[PDB]
C-alpha cells in the first residue's frame, strides 16, 4: 500500500591522535534496522540485527563483510584526501558520512534513488535524481566531481540503485513480511495531571506503533489548536516500534470537551479519544 525503501548509513571517523579511523555501517529496510558493521571490532563482520535476515546463509555474510571491509579502507583514504583538499590540520578529528538507498513504487520500479555525502556535518556531494549528475557543495567537491566524472561511477551507481538495491529490497520484504509488511497500530490512552489547581494537563499517548509516521491532533467540538499543544518528537520504543505524545492544558471540568485525534497506517479508522 506504501512505498518501501532500502537504505544504508556510513559514518567514517578519523582519530589522528590515534592515527587511525573508525568505520560504521547500518542498514535499514523502511524504519527497521537489519545489519551493522563496526571496524574497531576485533574480527569485524557484517552482522544480523533482526531475526529475519539470519535466514540468510554465510555466503551472503561473507560477501557483505568482504565489501564492508574494502569500504573501511577506501573511506579511510577519503579522510586523508579530504584533509589534503581542505589543507586540514594534522591533529583535528574529522567526520565523513554517506547515506544511500532505494525507494520502491508499487509499480516494481525505483521511484527515487539517492546517494549523498557530507563532511564535518555539512553537505559535500550528492548524486542527482536522474542518477546521472552530481551536485558539488564546494570547490573540494568539484575536485571529487571531476574525479568521479571520469571514473564514470554514476554509471556504477545508477545500475546498483536501479537493479541491485531494488532487487535486494524486494527479497528482504519477502523474508521479513511478518514484520516488515505489517503496520502496528499504536496503543493509545489519555492521562490527566494537574499542572495547576486551575490548569489541568491532558496528555494523549501513542505507544508501540510501526511504522514511524503518525498524526496526533487535539480538538474541542471540531476545533483544533496545535498552536497550544505540546508535542514530543517521535522516539523509538526500544523494540522496533515508536512512541509519541501530544499534551495540552484545559480549564478544570472542561476535560470532556477535548478530543485527541490519532491517524495511523495500522489503524482500522482514525481514533478520537476523550478523558475518562
Amino acid at each position: 500500500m506504501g512505498p518501501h525503501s532500502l537504505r544504508y548509513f556510513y559514518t567514517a571517523v578519523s582519530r589522528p591522535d590515534r592515527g587511525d579511523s573508525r568505520f560504521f555501517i547500518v542498514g535499514y529496510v523502511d524504519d527497521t534496522q537489519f545489519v551493522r558493521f563496526d571496524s574497531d571490532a576485533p574480527n569485524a563482520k557484517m552482522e544480523p540485527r533482526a531475526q529475519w535476515i539470519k535466514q540468510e546463509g554465510p555466503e551472503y555474510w561473507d560477501r557483505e563483510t568482504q565489501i564492508s571491509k574494502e569500504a573501511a579502507q577506501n573511506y579511510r583514504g577519503s579522510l586523508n584526501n579530504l584533509r589534503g583538499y581542505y589543507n586540514q590540520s594534522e591533529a583535528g578529528s574529522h567526520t565523513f558520512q554517506n547515506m544511500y538507498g532505494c525507494y520502491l513504487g508499487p509499480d516494481g520500479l525505483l521511484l527515487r534513488g539517492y546517494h549523498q555525502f557530507a563532511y564535518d556535518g555539512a553537505d559535500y556531494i550528492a548524486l542527482n535524481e536522474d542518477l546521472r549528475s552530481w551536485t558539488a557543495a564546494d570547490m573540494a567537491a568539484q575536485i571529487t566531481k571531476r574525479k568521479w566524472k571520469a571514473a564514470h561511477e554514476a554509471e556504477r551507481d545508477r545500475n546498483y540503485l536501479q537493479g541491485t538495491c531494488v532487487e535486494w529490497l524486494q527479497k528482504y520484504l519477502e523474508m521479513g513480511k511478518d514484520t516488515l509488511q505489517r503496520a502496528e497500530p499504536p496503543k493509545t490512552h489519555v492521562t490527566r495531571h494537574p499542572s495547576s489547581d486551575l490548569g489541568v494537563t491532558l496528555r494523549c499517548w501513542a505507544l508501540g506503533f510501526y511504522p514511524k509516521e503518525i498524526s496526533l491532533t487535539w480538538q474541542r467540538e471540531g476545533q483544533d489548536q496545535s498552536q497550544d499543544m505540546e508535542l514530543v518528537e517521535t522516539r523509538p520504543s526500544g523494540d522496533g516500534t515508536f512512541q509519541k505524545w501530544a499534551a495540552l492544558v484545559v480549564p478544570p471540568g472542561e476535560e470532556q470537551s477535548y478530543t485527541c485525534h490519532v491517524q495511523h497506517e495500522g489503524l482500522q479508522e482514525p481514533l478520537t479519544l476523550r478523558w475518562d
Partner: peptide, 9 residues
C-alpha cells in the same frame, strides 16, 4: 545488499 565502491573521493 551493500553497494561496493572501489573509489575514494
Amino acid at each position: 545488499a551493500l553497494l561496493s565502491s572501489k573509489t575514494s573521493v
